[PDB]
Amino acid sequence: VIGKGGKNIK
Amino acid sequence: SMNPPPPETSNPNKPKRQTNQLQYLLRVVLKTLWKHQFAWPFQQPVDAVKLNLPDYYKIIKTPMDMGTIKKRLENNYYWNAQECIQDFNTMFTNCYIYNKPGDDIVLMAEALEKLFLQKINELPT
Ligand code: NA
Protein backbone atom coordinates (compact mmCIF):
# COMPACT_ATOMS: atom_id res chain seq x y z
CA VAL A 1 0.00 0.00 0.00
CA ILE A 2 0.83 3.68 -0.34
CA GLY A 3 1.05 4.15 3.39
CA LYS A 4 0.80 7.19 5.54
CA GLY A 5 4.43 7.96 6.14
CA GLY A 6 6.34 9.23 9.11
CA LYS A 7 4.43 10.63 12.05
CA ASN A 8 7.35 12.05 13.97
CA ILE A 9 7.09 9.76 16.98
CA LYS A 10 10.90 9.34 17.29
CA SER B 1 -13.74 11.78 -4.43
CA MET B 2 -11.64 9.15 -2.73
CA ASN B 3 -13.53 9.87 0.51
CA PRO B 4 -16.93 8.51 1.55
CA PRO B 5 -19.44 10.34 3.72
CA PRO B 6 -18.56 9.87 7.38
CA PRO B 7 -20.32 7.17 9.43
CA GLU B 8 -23.70 8.01 10.90
CA THR B 9 -23.56 9.26 14.49
CA SER B 10 -27.25 9.20 15.52
CA ASN B 11 -29.29 6.03 16.05
CA PRO B 12 -32.78 6.52 14.57
CA ASN B 13 -35.70 5.85 16.93
CA LYS B 14 -33.43 4.62 19.71
CA PRO B 15 -34.59 5.57 23.22
CA LYS B 16 -32.11 7.40 25.44
CA ARG B 17 -30.62 4.94 28.00
CA GLN B 18 -27.70 6.20 30.09
CA THR B 19 -25.55 3.74 32.02
CA ASN B 20 -22.47 3.83 34.22
CA GLN B 21 -20.63 1.76 31.60
CA LEU B 22 -21.50 4.24 28.81
CA GLN B 23 -20.51 7.19 31.00
CA TYR B 24 -17.21 5.44 31.66
CA LEU B 25 -16.66 4.74 27.97
CA LEU B 26 -17.02 8.43 27.12
CA ARG B 27 -15.51 10.17 30.15
CA VAL B 28 -12.69 7.72 30.93
CA VAL B 29 -11.96 5.52 27.92
CA LEU B 30 -12.52 7.88 24.99
CA LYS B 31 -11.24 10.96 26.89
CA THR B 32 -7.97 9.19 27.95
CA LEU B 33 -7.25 8.00 24.36
CA TRP B 34 -8.33 11.41 22.88
CA LYS B 35 -5.73 13.37 25.00
CA HIS B 36 -2.88 10.96 24.15
CA GLN B 37 -0.04 12.38 22.05
CA PHE B 38 -0.67 9.65 19.43
CA ALA B 39 -4.43 10.23 19.08
CA TRP B 40 -4.40 12.79 16.27
CA PRO B 41 -4.41 10.41 13.25
CA PHE B 42 -7.49 8.74 14.72
CA GLN B 43 -9.57 11.78 15.76
CA GLN B 44 -11.40 12.09 12.42
CA PRO B 45 -12.12 9.87 9.41
CA VAL B 46 -9.12 9.02 7.27
CA ASP B 47 -8.97 11.84 4.67
CA ALA B 48 -7.69 9.98 1.62
CA VAL B 49 -7.85 13.14 -0.49
CA LYS B 50 -5.88 15.44 1.85
CA LEU B 51 -3.45 12.56 2.51
CA ASN B 52 -3.28 11.40 -1.14
CA LEU B 53 -4.30 7.82 -0.31
CA PRO B 54 -6.24 6.55 -3.35
CA ASP B 55 -6.00 2.96 -2.07
CA TYR B 56 -7.35 3.42 1.45
CA TYR B 57 -11.10 3.06 0.87
CA LYS B 58 -10.40 0.37 -1.73
CA ILE B 59 -9.16 -1.76 1.20
CA ILE B 60 -11.10 -0.48 4.23
CA LYS B 61 -14.80 -1.29 3.81
CA THR B 62 -15.98 -0.42 7.38
CA PRO B 63 -14.38 2.93 8.23
CA MET B 64 -14.19 3.97 11.86
CA ASP B 65 -12.42 6.66 13.87
CA MET B 66 -12.50 8.08 17.39
CA GLY B 67 -14.30 11.26 16.29
CA THR B 68 -17.17 9.09 15.14
CA ILE B 69 -17.10 7.01 18.34
CA LYS B 70 -17.02 10.19 20.43
CA LYS B 71 -20.07 11.59 18.66
CA ARG B 72 -21.86 8.24 18.88
CA LEU B 73 -21.33 8.24 22.66
CA GLU B 74 -22.42 11.87 22.91
CA ASN B 75 -25.57 11.05 20.94
CA ASN B 76 -26.33 7.88 22.94
CA TYR B 77 -25.99 5.80 19.77
CA TYR B 78 -24.83 2.65 21.56
CA TRP B 79 -27.22 0.40 23.47
CA ASN B 80 -24.40 -1.10 25.58
CA ALA B 81 -20.64 -1.20 26.05
CA GLN B 82 -19.99 -4.07 23.68
CA GLU B 83 -21.31 -2.07 20.74
CA CYS B 84 -18.93 0.78 21.54
CA ILE B 85 -15.98 -1.57 22.15
CA GLN B 86 -16.70 -3.17 18.75
CA ASP B 87 -16.22 0.22 17.06
CA PHE B 88 -12.90 0.81 18.83
CA ASN B 89 -11.81 -2.66 17.74
CA THR B 90 -12.84 -1.94 14.14
CA MET B 91 -10.79 1.27 14.17
CA PHE B 92 -7.70 -0.61 15.33
CA THR B 93 -8.30 -3.51 12.92
CA ASN B 94 -8.57 -1.15 9.96
CA CYS B 95 -5.22 0.35 10.88
CA TYR B 96 -3.55 -3.03 11.16
CA ILE B 97 -4.96 -4.46 7.93
CA TYR B 98 -4.16 -1.39 5.77
CA ASN B 99 -0.83 -0.11 7.06
CA LYS B 100 2.41 -2.06 6.82
CA PRO B 101 3.45 -3.60 10.16
CA GLY B 102 6.08 -1.42 11.74
CA ASP B 103 4.86 1.87 10.25
CA ASP B 104 4.56 4.78 12.66
CA ILE B 105 0.73 4.78 12.51
CA VAL B 106 0.74 1.11 13.53
CA LEU B 107 2.98 1.81 16.54
CA MET B 108 0.62 4.65 17.46
CA ALA B 109 -2.43 2.42 17.20
CA GLU B 110 -0.64 -0.22 19.27
CA ALA B 111 0.04 2.31 22.02
CA LEU B 112 -3.56 3.51 22.02
CA GLU B 113 -4.89 -0.05 22.00
CA LYS B 114 -2.84 -0.90 25.07
CA LEU B 115 -4.39 2.04 26.92
CA PHE B 116 -7.82 1.09 25.60
CA LEU B 117 -7.55 -2.46 26.91
CA GLN B 118 -6.27 -1.29 30.27
CA LYS B 119 -9.24 1.03 30.68
CA ILE B 120 -11.82 -1.52 29.44
CA ASN B 121 -10.55 -3.97 32.06
CA GLU B 122 -11.90 -1.52 34.67
CA LEU B 123 -15.35 -1.01 33.15
CA PRO B 124 -17.83 -0.53 36.05
CA THR B 125 -20.22 -3.36 36.83
NA1 NA C 1 -7.93 3.21 11.90
Number of domains into which chain B is organized: 1
Experimental approach was X-ray
Residue B8 lies in a domain: no
* Window 16-45 of B, Cβ < 8 Å to A: 38, 41
Min Cα–Cα distance to chain A from B6, Å = 20
Q: Is residue B7 part of a domain?
A: no
Q: Which DSSP category does B27 fall into? A: I
3 state SS of B105: helix
Please give the resolution of this entry in Å, rounded to 1 decimal.
1.4
Separation in Å, CA of A4 to nearest CA in chain B: 7
Domain that holds residue B23: 19-123
A9:B59 CB<8 A: no
Q: Assess if residue B57 is contained within a domain.
A: yes
- B112 within domain boundaries: yes
Residue B13 belongs to a domain: no
Residue B51: DSSP 8-state: T
Which of B23, A9, A6 minimizes the C-alpha distance to B100? A6
Asked whether residue B82 is assigned to any structural domain, the reply reads yes
Residue B116, Cβ density class (10 Å: 0-12 exposed, 13-18 middle, ≥19 buried): buried
Query: Which residues make Cβ contacts (< 8 Å) with residue B27, sequence separation at least 6?
Result: none
